[PDB]
């Protein structure tokens, strides 16, 4: 229990982190857009909602 | 003027005239509701409203 300590590990496991397009390298985000029509990567990465 | 097939089942007249019918209400204070939309306009003279 105690004082918070689950918050950094929710930014690691994407339970309350930032957007997928924002924790990935811009090279991989460019690649995922370019290939979207025939080799979707979208489902491989969690997007948080709170 | 309309014409229709004879039917002897009793009838009278229905027509729908489409128009705007916008009603809008303001509330200015706690427990006051006020409606502003005069429907069926005209009102001038001095006899029966």
């Amino acid at each position: 229990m105690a004082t918070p300590s689950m918050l950094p590990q929710w930014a690691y496991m994407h339970i309350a982190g930032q957007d997928a397009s924002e924790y990935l390298s811009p090279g991989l985000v460019q690649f995922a857009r370019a290939t979207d029509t025939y080799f979707s990567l979208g489902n491989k990465f969690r997007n948080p909602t709170v | 003027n309309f014409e229709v097939d004879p039917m002897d089942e009793s009838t009278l007249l229905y027509v729908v005239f489409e128009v705007f019918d916008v009603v809008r209400v303001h509330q200015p204070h706690r427990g006051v509701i006020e409606a502003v939309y005069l429907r069926t306009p005209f009102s001038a003279g001095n006899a029966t409203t």
Binding site: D19, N47, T49, V50 | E18, F20
Partner: peptide
Amino acid sequence: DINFSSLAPFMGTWSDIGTS
């Protein structure tokens, strides 16, 4: 014809500075 039209006006489901 027919009428009656009405119109309505990052992660985490809200954040705003809407006041008088």
